[PDB]
Amino acid sequence: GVEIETISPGDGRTFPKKGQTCVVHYTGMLQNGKKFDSSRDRNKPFKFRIGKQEVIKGFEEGAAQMSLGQRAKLTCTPDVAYGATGHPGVIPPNATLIFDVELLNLE
Template identity: 50%
Template sequence: MKLSVLLTTLLGLNSLVSAQENNGSSDKELAIVVEYEVAECKYKTKNGDTVSVHYTGELEDGVVFDSSLPRQRPIQFTLGSGQVIKGWEEGLLDMCVGEKRKLIIPPHLAYGKRGAGGVIPPDATLIFYTELVEIENIPKDEL
């Protein structure tokens, strides 16, 4: 009898875990891969910093949908102000000037069910290759 109760409990837990795993992309987390780390970093980005970032954005199939590189002009925004998608807000924190990161952003931290501009489909996971170019108003000796 005890074995039967234990087995039923374990099967119930297994079903619960499986249901959570198959609950769609909203359960996925942001993945951050540091592709280049600077040797010495005295200042890391935080909310409120105005940053300049070079980036290339891709869909999971490798199709590039946007890049600052051909324009030779990084995007500039204030971290934590809601100017960019949540995946960027989270993925670019604690970053050093010169550092390069690959961000794999699930739909709920990107454009979700609505997609964007006819280029990014609904529920798309996005991949961004980023490089922090500058943090404004930080003395050079603190970088």
């Protein structure tokens, strides 16, 4: 269940394809609103190649749905992201996550 609220309009010229690395600055928060992770604080773009299982399924699906230069409100169900088991100390069990991603470039 990826319902992307288009925060900023995307270019629409290109979309992610298998074998291409994706560059994002994903800001994350829980359903209650508290922030758990913000790559922006690290100040380093997160790089991952689409197609493999490097990232969670929900993030990959949202990136595939998203376009270059588009900011979207990424909502993930507990089934697609973590679930009954999660990262100990960070993500509570069976809790939804609300990601905020934006694609600087697609490579």
